[PDB]
Amino acid sequence: LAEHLLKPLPADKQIETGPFLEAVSHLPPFFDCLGSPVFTPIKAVISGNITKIKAVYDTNPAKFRTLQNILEVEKEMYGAEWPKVGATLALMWLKRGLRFIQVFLQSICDGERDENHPNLIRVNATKAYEMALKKYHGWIVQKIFQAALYAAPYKSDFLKALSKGQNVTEEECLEKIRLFLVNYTATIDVIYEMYTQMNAELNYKV
Amino acid sequence: LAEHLLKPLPADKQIETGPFLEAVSHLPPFFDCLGSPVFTPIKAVISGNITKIKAVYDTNPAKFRTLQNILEVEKEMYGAEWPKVGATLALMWLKRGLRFIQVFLQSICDGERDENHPNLIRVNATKAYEMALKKYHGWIVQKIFQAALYAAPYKSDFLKALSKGQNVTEEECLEKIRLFLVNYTATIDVIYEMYTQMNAELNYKV
Ligand SMILES: CCCCCCCCCCCCC/C=C/[C@@H](O)[C@H](CO[C@@H]1O[C@H](COS(=O)(=O)O)[C@H](O)[C@H](OS(=O)(=O)O)[C@H]1O)NC(=O)CCCCCCCCCCC
Ligand SMILES: CCCCCCCCCCCCC/C=C/[C@@H](O)[C@H](CO[C@@H]1O[C@H](COS(=O)(=O)O)[C@H](O)[C@H](OS(=O)(=O)O)[C@H]1O)NC(=O)CCCCCCCCCCC
């Protein structure tokens, strides 16, 4: 988050793949900021999506210059297999990870907390799950997630972690997150919109 | 499993890194044979270890010809950071994955089953966990694992999956697993032994 930020969207509202991936590839360290091995495989899972995208991009950076480029090339290339293939499926899942991240931090900067347990971040994690991922998952993965929330940190530890290196007050640092959240939220919206427009979203549970 | 098998160990009992990685890189598809998204991030997690190993090997295949080569080069290179770095830490975790796999299939070929639920494989998965991974994990990851067992298949489905492509009777196919299990078990033993000998094992919980 914080330091290497995604720049804002333009007229055409196209997101360049190169810059996008350079950007998002900083976000899995962050799972280290949850501060537990419980969360290792999740990060792996997102490195995964990203790699799969970078794989396609690199086969021909011009041909796949923008994120739409990918979706539209793959639609042609693969049959009715699409969108359930390729980078389109990777970005499809990744955008949901980014969105979770997005809702989560939003929730934390906004001061949504549980009155009882106010330095836990389970409420902030659950709201995230519910907006970003729940509908695509069966009960088991939800049970798991709830159980993972016990390995989540207290809020204040989480933020030291996010800011680790920088020597700012917690208050100062939340402020850095809000600014991050501006073009992050913007960008996720643009991808979500695209997926709806190109008709690449899958609405059913894995 | 089955088709691309690791060849047996020699006099020196050294395991060549190239052949080893070519071998093991077939094993994550297998998690697809559990037949659920619950298990996706695990496979990612093992692709991970493997990648990290292949990364080092490729920087100089001769210098890291054998698996011991790696452990011993890294010991010198890194400080008292070692063995908690590098490929040594990757192979350290990977060998535990391979061992889980190893105990699991053993257990299934041997006909260890729960008398009540005899076509479930939870008992076979739990024995595995307990021998291979439990001691290195805290209660949460165990809860999770138990909960993942509900997304595990019935035994007979699992085996169709493992053999998918081949058109053999279940009985015939278990027989293919037993033979696989010969040099697989042998090889994991040789790595476990090495790690003890070079003093690279970490016995405490992540
Ligand atoms: C012994 C140790 C433990 C034992 C086993 C327990 C393992 C449980 C693991 C946790 C629960 C699973 C959660 C993840 C489920 C994933 O299946 C989903 C969907 O992931 C996609 O699956 C897809 C399946 O494909 S399809 O069938 O063709 O549609 C794809 O293969 C896709 O791969 S790709 O090639 O496109 O690149 C892949 O990302 N993963 C996610 O939902 C990612 C969510 C991001 C995590 C957000 C952060 C969570 C933080 C939690 C805080 C409490
Ligand atoms: C919303 C979706 C879900 C939300 C979040 C829930 C996520 C729960 C995920 C399942 C539970 C976690 C199980 C895995 C825990 C891992 O931490 C452990 C240890 O993994 C190692 O961690 C290490 C931590 O490093 S250390 O702190 O410096 O020591 C390393 O980073 C290492 O990376 S490497 O660079 O060396 O390559 C890494 O493999 N993973 C394992 O134990 C792997 C086990 C293999 C799985 C075997 C198959 C299970 C099948 C289950 C069937 C029921």
From Swiss-Prot, chains A, B:
Sequence repeats lie at residues 42-52, 53-63. It comes from the Eukaryota. It comes from Homo sapiens. Residues 42-63 are annotated as: 2 X 12 AA approximate tandem repeats. PANTHER family: GLYCOLIPID TRANSFER PROTEIN, GLYCOLIPID TRANSFER PROTEIN-RELATED. Accelerates the intermembrane transfer of various glycolipids. Catalyzes the transfer of various glycosphingolipids between membranes but does not catalyze the transfer of phospholipids. May be involved in the intracellular translocation of glucosylceramides. It is found in: Cytoplasm. Pfam families: GLTP. Changing residue 100 to S: About 25% decrease in activity. The keyword Hydrolase does not apply. Keywords: Acetylation, Cytoplasm, Lipid transport, Repeat, Transport. Signal peptide: none annotated. Gene3D superfamilies: Glycolipid transfer protein. One of its GO terms (molecular function) is ceramide 1-phosphate transfer activity. The keyword Membrane does not apply. GO terms for biological process: ceramide transport; intermembrane lipid transfer; response to immobilization stress. This is Glycolipid transfer protein. Monomer. Beta-D-galactosyl-(1->4)-beta-D-glucosyl-(1<->1)-N-[(9Z)-octadecenoyl]-sphing-4-enine binds at residues 45-52, 137, 204. GO terms for cellular component: cytosol. Changing residue 42 to N: 18% decrease in activity. Transmembrane segments: none annotated.
